[PDB]
Design a protein around this ligand. Structure first.
Ligand SMILES: Cc1cc2nc3c(=O)[nH]c(=O)nc-3n(C[C@H](O)[C@H](O)[C@H](O)COP(=O)(O)OP(=O)(O)OC[C@H]3O[C@@H](n4cnc5c(N)ncnc54)[C@H](O)[C@@H]3O)c2cc1C
Ligand SMILES: O=C1NCc2c1c1c3ccccc3[nH]c1c1[nH]c3ccccc3c21
Ligand SMILES: [Cl-]
Length: 512
């Protein structure tokens, strides 16, 4: 006869986002538990590209190294190429080097990475440990005044147990049963696109392609993308449906006569949706459950991870007791607008490919087809197609303009924006200073800092003060004092600390 289990945060869903939230909560020493209905095994990778901002967060949570050393070949091309057929005529290619050779980015200590879900999942599961309960399905929940009660069914054995948690964070996906149960709607913002995904293994295809290999192959037969999943034989063909045999589809897209074994052929319905509300009482929505966006630019999962990181610190602060009563509401305040708009940027990338048409003689071998291909190439570059593969602003430019920020692409320390990266040492970035409590960076004068420290202490708001004597970084941040939030974003800056510190403290913690 087992009794109710107690934990501060119960995370519903062990997908990438739910795991990201668990990592942040562990990093902040908040008791939590993750319940995942499946056994946690991946049979058909849905994600693989990890944006630089997400990698910075994985760096913070201590798993960035293993993600990078998970198995993506250091010498595999990262290029994006528009081709009339893989192995056939090439139309346009965006060179992106290789993991081992590309220049270290100047704006971030962590460039993007490739980690197919079948590697990421075990890796995330390993980092979350025993707090991840697989084959566990949350059947129902009931909110009470100071906690939420959930009934969990052990799908391995068959026994049902109850979990009493202070907060339930639903990371249960795009069709979020939890969102429905809360009576919150997520009205479509664009027509539902139905995609057919064919996961196949072609052991010798990379050898046949060689340097002509690519991470992304945008075919133009009739038009769709083919991806190198693990850079080791596993590929994924994505074709829009709006019906040939799975094997015959791949065969048509690949001009080579090589071993091709289709492993999976499932369907995917993408419906750009954003919840009208990101929470009800003590129940929260994160990831696709809160906002489903288009995968263009890997924008979807990266936004979920960023939203998970935002809710993580606001939850910790409230559980700790130093947060104002209105801090948790700022999760929706700051993250929904990121979805409401940012879901549009992904859509633009989808539209550009959905609208591109193909002319006659594009497959020809004569100098004519080579000329018409060069024609489409020019158009492609003009339509800004290389923007879906290079948009730092999209990964790092989101600036919060909220009730807890004191308002006043290139890295900027303006209030609301991500505090910029700069190397302290060859291994330590300004980013490595953020992630715990608030951080006050002072460039030069330390006059007035003791006042800030006391103001934060009077409210029990964690604050770490750092004096920096580096002009290059001071120039970068543009002000003498910069107050950074637990999430790495600037809450306030200025050459002179404000007069009413109590006001500042109550505002940034969501008490004002
Ligand atoms: C068939 C399919 C194909 C896709 N293809 C692509 C693609 O090609 N590119 C792309 O960018 N994105 C793709 N996606 C979307 C991508 O997987 C998500 O955007 C991403 O992983 C976001 O993660 P999430 O963590 O919010 O939720 P999800 O990854 O959707 O995970 C939700 C988790 O909740 C668990 N869960 C649900 N209900 C319960 C319960 N009652 N109790 C316990 N656990 C529960 C699930 O088992 C699951 O593991 C696809 C999705 C599907 C369904
Ligand atoms: O993961 C994906 N799954 C589908 C996808 C993905 C990605 C994707 C993933 C990471 C980075 C850029 C990306 N662009 C696209 C994409 N551009 C497209 C155009 C038409 C139809 C589908 C896509 C597409
Ligand atoms: Cl509480």
């Amino acid at each position: 006869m087992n009794a109710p289990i107690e934990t501060d945060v119960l995370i519903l869903g062990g997908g990438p986002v739910g795991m990201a939230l668990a990592l942040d909560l562990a990093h902040r020493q908040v008791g939590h538990l993750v319940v995942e209905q499946t056994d946690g095994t991946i049979t058909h990778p849905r994600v693989g590209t990890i944006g630089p901002r997400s990698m910075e967060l994985f760096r913070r949570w201590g798993v960035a190294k293993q993600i990078r050393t998970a198995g993506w070949p250091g010498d595999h091309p990262l290029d994006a190429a528009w081709v009339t057929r893989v192995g056939g005529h090439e139309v346009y290619r965006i060179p992106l080097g290789t993991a081992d050779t590309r220049a270290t980015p100047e704006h971030t200590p962590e460039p993007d990475a490739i980690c197919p879900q079948h590697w990421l999942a075990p890796l995330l599961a390993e980092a979350v440990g025993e707090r991840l309960r697989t084959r566990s399905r949350l059947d129902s929940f009931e909110q009470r005044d100071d906690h939420v009660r959930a009934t969990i069914t052990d799908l391995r054995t068959g026994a049902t147990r109850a979990v009493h948690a202070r907060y339930l964070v639903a990371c249960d996906g795009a069709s979020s049963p939890t969102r429905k149960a809360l009576g919150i709607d997520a009205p479509p913002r664009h027509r539902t696109q139905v995609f057919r995904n064919i996961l196949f293994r072609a052991p010798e295809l990379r050898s046949l392609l060689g340097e002509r290999a690519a991470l992304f192959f945008f075919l133009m037969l009739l038009r769709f993308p083919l991806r190198a999943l693990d850079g080791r034989g596993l590929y994924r063909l994505t074709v829009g449906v709006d019906t040939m045999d799975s094997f015959e589809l791949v065969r048509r897209a690949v001009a080579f006569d090589t071993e091709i074994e289709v492993l999976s052929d499932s369907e995917w319905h993408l419906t750009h949706r954003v919840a009208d509300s990101f929470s009800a009482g003590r129940v929260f929505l994160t990831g696709d459950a809160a906002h489903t966006l288009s995968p263009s630019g890997g924008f979807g999962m990266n936004t979920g991870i960023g939203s998970a990181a935002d809710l993580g610190w606001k939850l910790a602060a409230t559980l700790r007791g130093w947060a104002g009563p209105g801090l948790l509401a700022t999760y929706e305040e700051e993250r929904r607008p990121v979805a409401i708009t940012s879901l549009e940027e992904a859509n633009v990338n989808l539209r550009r490919t959905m609208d591109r048409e193909l002319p006659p003689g594009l497959h020809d071998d004569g100098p004519r087809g080579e000329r018409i291909r060069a024609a489409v190439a020019e158009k492609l570059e003009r339509s800004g197609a290389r923007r879906e593969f290079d948009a730092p602003g999209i990964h790092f430019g989101h600036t919060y303009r909220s009730s807890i920020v004191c308002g006043e692409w290139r890295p900027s320390a303006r209030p609301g924006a991500r505090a910029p990266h700069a190397w302290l040492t060859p291994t330590t970035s300004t980013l490595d200073l953020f992630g715990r409590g608030f951080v006050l960076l002072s460039f030069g004068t330390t006059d007035g800092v003791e006042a800030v420290t006391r103001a934060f202490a009077d409210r029990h708001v964690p604050l770490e003060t750092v004096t920096c004597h580096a002009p290059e970084i001071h120039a970068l941040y543009e002000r003498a004092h910069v107050l950074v939030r637990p999430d790495g974003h600037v809450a306030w800056r200025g050459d002179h600390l404000p007069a009413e510190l109590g006001g500042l403290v109550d505002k940034v913690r969501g008490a004002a």
